[PDB]
Amino acid sequence: AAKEGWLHFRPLVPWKQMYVVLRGHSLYLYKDKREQPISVNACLIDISYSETKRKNVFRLTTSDCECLFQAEDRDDMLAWIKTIQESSNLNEEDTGVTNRDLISRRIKEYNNL
């Protein structure tokens, strides 16, 4: 694993505790650490300011989902964000295309909201 640890999780598109393992660019969520995905090769990832009142939360957005993960502290959140970022194998062109499409969808939703 590139990184693993407990995170509180809830989808946008109640919180439950999940054991999360990032392998390659696949994010695995396990109910039980003892019994071990979301592809993050093409994603947006940022600090959640207003989707939650909780601190230390990152918002993950892909073509298939949008969800919140709460880390133990600021450094843990930052370490998760960075490792997820670093896991993508997409080139500059494909990064630009996927970023464009994910952002444009997000603008549309917030122009509605």
Binding site: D46, Y49, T95, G96, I103
Partner: protein, 165 residues
């Protein structure tokens, strides 16, 4: 009553910091914004819906997706970044040439005034060529996003612009 604001500028200028300083009264942890944050800020009986749009070079082509319906433009400049001030000028001018933004007033935040030898508002005015903007109300406001200095007077100016139309 209400005012739609587009807040743009080069990456690292302090835009997200400004938004949440205003919205939450906090100095938030940030990473480069790939996309946008949007918040409504209530100030002196006006509801400012502020779009904080990422300024990384590769996503500047996306700025155009936010132009329609903006009443005020906030352009944030890192006053410590002498290396990229002309680049900031060029990006600003490109945006100001867009017909979707013809009616938008322009607020320039000369941010990071706390940093040693930061360019003052007078210098930024000169380096951005702001006087050449003869067909648009514009105003420059020196700021420190982390302390909040300058931020409310910027909102004062925007408020007067709304009120006067």
């Amino acid at each position: 009553g209400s005012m739609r604001i587009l807040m743009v500028g080069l990456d690292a200028a302090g835009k997200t910091t400004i938004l949440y300083k205003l919205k939450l009264g906090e100095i938030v942890t940030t990473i480069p914004t790939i996309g946008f944050n949007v918040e409504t800020v209530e100030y002196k009986n006006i509801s400012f819906t502020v779009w904080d749009v990422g300024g990384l070079d590769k996503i500047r082509p996306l700025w155009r997706h936010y132009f329609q319906n903006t009443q005020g433009l906030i352009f944030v400049v890192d006053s410590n970044d002498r290396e990229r001030v002309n680049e900031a000028r060029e990006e600003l001018m490109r945006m100001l040439a867009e017909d979707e933004l013809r009616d938008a007033v322009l607020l320039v935040f000369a941010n990071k005034q706390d940093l040693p030898n930061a360019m003052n508002a007078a210098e930024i005015t000169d380096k951005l060529g702001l006087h050449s903007l003869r067909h648009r109300n514009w105003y420059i406001q020196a700021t420190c996003a982390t302390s909040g200095d300058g931020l409310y007077e910027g909102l004062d100016w925007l408020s007067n612009q709304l009120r006067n139309q």
